């Protein structure tokens, strides 16, 4: 699906994904993630692979734009993300963006 974000088109909005379970190195944080993960994205905004020369740049945009857009939309519904929430969203959305890169790369 094509998309416009922040006034720029040429984005794609990926499919709704099975959001991975991320581990953080304590059981507490792992449980916090399980209890909160429904608040985090399950789909990612990205741009065509050919607009980058490397994987890290593709993934950086995907993480950055996805979380920006998610924060806008969810703020309008009364959400507020803690520092911990932001960190955890960065980690899961990074994984989902790397998975998407690998789909683009094998195509």
């Amino acid at each position, epitope marked *: 699906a094509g998309a416009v974000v922040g*006034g720029l088109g040429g984005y794609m909005l990926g499919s709704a994904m099975s959001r991975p379970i991320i581990h953080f190195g304590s059981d507490y944080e792992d449980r916090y993630y399980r209890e909160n993960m429904h608040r985090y994205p399950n789909q990612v905004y990205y*741009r065509p692979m050919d*607009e980058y*020369s*490397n994987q890290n740049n593709f993934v950086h945009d995907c993480v950055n734009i996805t979380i920006k857009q998610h924060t806008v939309t969810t703020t309008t519904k009364g959400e507020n993300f803690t520092e911990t929430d932001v960190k955890m969203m960065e980690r899961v959305v990074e994984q989902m963006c790397i998975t998407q890169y690998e789909r683009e790369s094998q195509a």
Partner: nanobody
Amino acid sequence: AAQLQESGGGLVQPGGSLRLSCAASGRTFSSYNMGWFRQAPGKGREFVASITSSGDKSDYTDSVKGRFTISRDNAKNTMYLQMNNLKPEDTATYYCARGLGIYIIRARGGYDHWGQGTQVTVSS
């Protein structure tokens, strides 16, 4: 028709330093995010660094982070790229460009108004 023009390129020894400039015509410089890209023969144009309209945030590609510094002088319609600890792999034509949309990104499609470029060659 805002026009961008790069300058400051040259031939630099490895480990050397160069400062590039990007001069903008017109009267809306400070209203737009801006970025630097580079292109070497055989490769496509790739992200180097970016800076928001107000200068409040900047961004870099991994391979130049810590060596290169982007800045802008909003009173003088000019952006700069300070390139330190230059390496052979930094050889390229460097382009400045104006951001599209409200967010600085790394993608080629995030910018337009490309200048004609300035050549940087780092010897080896």
